[PDB]
């Protein structure tokens, strides 16, 4: 390879340098994994150390349980009360966990920490089964068990209509046996581990008049649970034999060429028409209105396994996110695994070695990781709804009183406006017909996805301070499409404004409408005419709008710093393989030294730039991407920010005046970085030579230096 690290890491992996092109990619699926991984952990632990203002694996809890002084200083950790966010992970029907689970689950996160980030050994994530000790297989057995048995309970339904016709067809058999190989279906794909298309396979069987007899207009009312019915019937004739599809598979496995697959595959679908057509036909013709509306009616006319020790941990993982990010985790995952079981097939077809090293072999084996696809592909597909608790929504209400307006003021206050507000009478009770306030806070800030990802990730001391610089409103606000910028004016626009078409107007109006928001307008919303209606639409938009801006800053800001996490683990990671080892100077960790080593018009400009590069700055850049203090220190330095067009120019100018005015530069070894702070300082925006300089560690490879070095590459 171009890197020169395929002999390195072939040794790393395998034993001995390979003369082919097909294992560095296995390689780099594995690579991409881990990287995935770090990502997601680091972004859980700062989330951790965010909702509560302040790890050795091997403090078993016994040893710790005798220490008095050190185990107090985590007794009252554990008692915070603002762990409700995170919704099941710490707590469960509305009783905390016990304590030996909460230490299990925080102690394989640290774990987790320490081994992406790279005692625990290198090859500790692939062989579980013999280094995780006692007492920590418990904690995951137990969520399992609680997950499987809550999915067990709640399958059995929004699909019970097929499943009455597949128990229909199958009269003979015992009632597991239809549900089991419908679940193995749709959830786990059992239908991918074969060599056939019955995709294909379907369509050269309608070309035969036998069964084509369903292809009128009218049969376009249910297309979903008519072709996937008859995949399920295939898949189960081929498995019924195991003969005749073991025979088609050494008939397709000695083809010639593709003429002689299409006429076998011609002739296998004619035999099946002919077979089982008066079953398709019976099966087809048993689907109409009627029947799926009386089926639907009686949806109530075992499952649980256990799973691999690696899929409970990303079960674990799962606890402590949201929606968007799960999905992006398990896709990610899902498409890794995929293609190291095709690189797999395709190098064992090829009559090549195969297997790892003794310490990966435990895992990364054809078997295993077939498993672990299908396991992930379960832990996929369970519905979430994430719902808001029931003794968590007090403090919930608490800090949204403290978003819109009335922030950093005593708890006291609140208490005497809520009280206000909300009245309550006699006895803790309600006063019927005077709550108009609450349903409104409750329906849209207390069930909002975008009010959790701010308290998570924000202060709701000092959130409001985002939303008062006219030009990171505009940018934010110019982002959205048309269509809905279009529409938020045509509802939030008044009485007082003549209409406008213009997009520059819009956005001028808007930004001045959000500029000044407050509980107090709220103070007086319809309670249970049509001004009432148009008032209350216009206080929705307008508190939808409030939060999707902050929580769209927020959001990109964390995703820039993912997107440079990804960089330092990857230096971290080949500055091993080398074998050259990062030294200190003053205690200063000197990250420049891989760019170095490997150097003794690309090598002009890196040349040029190796000279302009202070230790501090790039120790104080590691320190802040590693902590993400981007958005814990973005409300002391967005409030004077001159003009913006990419989220890039925002997080490097924040980066830069952290680094201004927390001192952490030094003039002596180098004079120079004083003419970028000036500019820094006279231009209100980020210096693209300063961001070009503290990047430096990152020489040994150019497209990396130039997709994090140049803005209009970055996107691209």
């Not at 430096?696 to 490879?701: A, N």
């Given at each position: 390879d171009l890197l020169c690290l395929k002999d390195k890491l072939e040794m790393h992996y395998f034993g001995k340098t390979f003369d082919d092109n097909i294992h560095i990619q296995l390689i780099y699926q594995i690579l991409d994994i881990e990287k995935i991984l770090a990502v997601h952990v680091n972004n859980i632990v700062f989330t951790l150390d965010n909702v509560l203002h302040p790890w050795r694996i091997n403090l078993d809890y016994q040893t710790l349980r005798g220490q008095t002084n050190k185990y107090d200083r985590f007794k009252n950790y554990i008692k915070r009360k603002e762990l409700l966010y995170f919704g099941e992970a710490f707590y469960h029907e509305n009783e905390r966990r016990y304590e030996e689970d909460i230490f299990a689950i925080l102690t394989l996160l640290s774990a987790l920490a320490q081994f992406c980030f790279a005692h625990v050994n290198s090859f500790w994530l692939y062989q579980l089964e013999d280094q995780l000790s006692d007492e920590f297989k418990e904690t995951l057995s137990i969520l399992w068990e609680e997950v499987t048995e809550r999915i067990d309970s709640e399958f059995l339904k929004t699909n019970t209509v097929n499943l009455h016709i597949l128990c229909h067809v199958f009269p003979k058999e015992s009632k597991e046996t239809i549900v089991r190989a419908y679940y193995e279906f749709l959830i786990k794909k059992s239908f991918k581990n074969m060599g056939f298309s019955i995709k294909k396979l379907r369509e050269i069987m309608l070309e035969q008049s036998d069964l084509k007899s369903?292809?009128?207009?009218?049969?376009?009312?249910?297309?979903a649970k008519l072709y996937k019915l008859f995949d399920f019937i295939i898949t189960y004739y081929y498995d019924h034999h195991a003969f005749e599809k073991e025979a088609l598979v050494s008939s397709l496995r000695s083809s010639l060429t593709e003429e002689n697959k299409e006429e076998i595959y011609i002739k296998t679908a004619r035999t099946l028409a002919s077979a089982l057509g008066a079953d398709f036909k019976k099966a087809a013709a048993d689907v109409n209105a009627k029947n799926i509306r009386d089926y639907q009616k009686k949806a109530n006319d075992i499952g649980n396994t256990g799973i691999g020790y690696f899929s409970e941990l990303i079960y674990m993982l799962t606890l402590l996110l949201d929606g968007k990010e799960i999905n992006d985790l398990l896709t990610t995952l899902i498409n890794k695994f995929d293609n190291i079981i095709s690189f797999i097939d395709i190098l064992k077809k090829l009559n090549l070695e195969f297997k790892f090293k003794p310490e990966y072999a435990d895992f990364f084996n054809m078997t295993n990781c077939r498993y672990t696809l299908e396991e992930l592909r379960v832990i996929n597909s369970i519905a979430r709804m994430q719902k808001p608790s029931a003794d968590a929504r007090k403090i919930m209400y608490r800090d949204a009183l403290r978003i819109l307006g009335m922030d950093n003021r005593p708890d006291e206050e609140i208490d005497r406006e809520l009280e206000r507000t909300m009245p309550v009478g006699a006895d803790g009770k309600f006063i019927k017909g005077k709550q108009g306030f609450r349903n409104f806070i409750a329906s849209n800030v207390i069930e909002s996805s975008r009010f959790h990802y701010l308290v998570r990730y924000n202060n709701p001391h000092k959130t409001r301070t985002l939303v008062k610089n006219p030009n990171v409103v505009k940018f934010v606000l110019e982002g959205i499409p048309e269509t809905q910028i279009k529409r938020y004016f045509d509802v939030c626009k008044g009485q007082e404004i003549p209409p406008t078409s213009d997009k520059s107007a819009q956005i001028d109006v808007l930004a001045r409408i959000i500029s000044s928001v407050d509980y107090k307008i709220f103070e007086d919303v319809p309670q249970s005419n049509f001004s009432d209606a148009l008032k209350k639409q216009r206080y929705q938009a307008i508190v939808s709008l409030y939060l999707t801006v902050m929580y769209l800053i927020t959001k990109n800001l964390v995703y820039v710093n993912s997107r440079y996490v990804i960089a330092f683990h990857c230096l971290e990671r080949d500055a091993f393989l080398h074998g050259v080892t990062l030294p200190k100077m003053n205690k200063k960790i000197v990250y420049s030294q891989l760019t170095t080593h490997l150097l003794t018009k690309w090598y002009v400009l890196v040349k040029n730039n190796l000279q302009n590069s202070d230790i501090t700055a790039v120790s104080s850049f590691a320190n802040i991407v590693a902590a993400i203090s981007v958005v814990r220190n973005s409300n002391e330095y967005i409030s004077g920010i001159g003009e913006l067009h990419s989220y890039f120019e925002l997080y490097h100018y924040l980066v830069q005046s952290m680094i201004a005015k927390n001192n952490w530069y030094d003039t002596s070894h180098q004079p120079k970085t004083a003419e970028y702070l000036n500019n820094l300082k006279k231009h209100h925006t980020y210096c693209k030579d300063f961001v070009k300089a503290y990047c430096?560690?990152?020489?040994?490879?150019v497209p990396r230096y130039k997709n994090l070095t140049i803005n209009e590459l970055f996107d691209r």
């Open positions: 369903f292809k009128e207009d009218k049969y376009n009312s249910v297309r430096i560690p990152f020489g040994y490879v």
